[PDB]
Amino acid sequence: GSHGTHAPLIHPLPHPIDLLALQQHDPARFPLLMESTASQGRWSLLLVAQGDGLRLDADGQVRDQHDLVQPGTFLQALDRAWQHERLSHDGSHSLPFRGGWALMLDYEVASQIEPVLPARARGDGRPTALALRCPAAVLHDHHNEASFVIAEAGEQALLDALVALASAALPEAGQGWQPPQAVGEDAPQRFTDGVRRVIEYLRAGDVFQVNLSRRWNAQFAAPVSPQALYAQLRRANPAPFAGLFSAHGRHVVSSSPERLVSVHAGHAQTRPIAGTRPRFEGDDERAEHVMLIDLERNDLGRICLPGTVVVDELMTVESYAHVHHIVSNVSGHLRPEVTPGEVIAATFPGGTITGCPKVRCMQIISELEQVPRGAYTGAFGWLNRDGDLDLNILIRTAEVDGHEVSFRTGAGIVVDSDPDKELDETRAKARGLLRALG
Ligand X SMILES: C[C@H](CCC(=O)NCCC[N+](C)(C)CCCS(=O)(=O)[O-])[C@H]1CC[C@H]2[C@@H]3[C@H](O)C[C@@H]4C[C@H](O)CC[C@]4(C)[C@H]3C[C@H](O)[C@]12C
CA dihedral sign, ordered 252, 230, 408, 262: positive
- Given candidates 69, 290, 305, 321, which one binds ligand X under the rule CB under 6 A? 305
**DSSP label at 27?**
G
Q: Taking the complex as a whole, how short is the minimal distance between the CB of residue 194 and Mg ion, in angstroms? A: 21
Q: Taking the complex as a whole, how short is the minimal distance between the CB of residue 77 and ligand X, in angstroms? A: 26
Q: Taking the complex as a whole, how short is the minimal distance between the CB of residue 26 and Mg ion, in angstroms? A: 51
The window from 78-86, 210-218, 299-307, 416-424 that contacts ligand X (CB under 6 A) reads 299-307
Q: By CB under 5 A, what part of segment 269-308 binds Mg ion?
A: 281, 284
From the list ligand X, Mg ion, none, partner contacted by residue 429 (C-beta under 5 to 8 A by kind): none
Choose between 123 and 238: whose C-beta lies nearer to ligand X.
Answer: 238
- Given candidates 9, 18, 23, 422, which one binds ligand X under the rule CB under 6 A? 18
From the list ligand X, Mg ion, none, partner contacted by residue 333 (C-beta under 5 to 8 A by kind): ligand X
Q: Taking the complex as a whole, how short is the minimal distance between the CB of residue 208 and Mg ion, in angstroms? A: 15
From the list Mg ion, ligand X, none, partner contacted by residue 336 (C-beta under 5 to 8 A by kind): ligand X
Q: By CB under 5 A, what part of segment 21-60 binds Mg ion?
A: none
- Given candidates 24, 29, 34, 35, which one binds ligand X under the rule CB under 6 A? 35
Single-letter code of the amino acid located at 154: G
- Residues 169-198, one symbol each (x = binds ligand X by CB under 6 A, - = not), give ----xx------------------------
The yes or no reply on residue 425 touching Mg ion (CB under 5 A) is no
d(CA 294, CA 333): 21
Is 284 assigned a ligand-binding role in the annotation?
A: yes
For residue 426, the Cα-to-chain-centroid distance in whole angstroms is 20
Q: By CB under 6 A, what part of segment 232-271 binds ligand X?
A: 234-235, 238, 266
d(CA 82, CA 131): 10
Half-sphere exposure of 342 (CA within 13 A, CB side): 15
Pairing mode of beta strands 250-254, 242-247 = antiparallel
Instruction: Say if CB 347 and CB 113 are below 8 A apart.
Output: no
Q: By CB under 6 A, what part of segment 66-105 binds ligand X?
A: none
Choose between 35 and 369: whose C-beta lies nearer to ligand X.
Answer: 35
From the list Mg ion, ligand X, none, partner contacted by residue 306 (C-beta under 5 to 8 A by kind): ligand X
Distances (CA, A) of 325 to 260, 269, 277, 318: 20, 20, 11, 9
d(CA 254, CA 380): 9
Half-sphere exposure of 163 (CA within 13 A, CB side): 16
Q: Identify any residues that bridge with 408 across adjacent strands, giving them in sequence order.
A: 215
d(CA 3, CA 370): 53
From the list ligand X, Mg ion, none, partner contacted by residue 42 (C-beta under 5 to 8 A by kind): ligand X
Known binding residues are: 284
Which residues form the interface with Mg ion (CB under 5 A)?
A: 281, 284
Which residues form the interface with ligand X (CB under 6 A)?
A: 18, 20, 35, 42, 173-174, 231, 234-235, 238, 266, 305-308, 333, 336
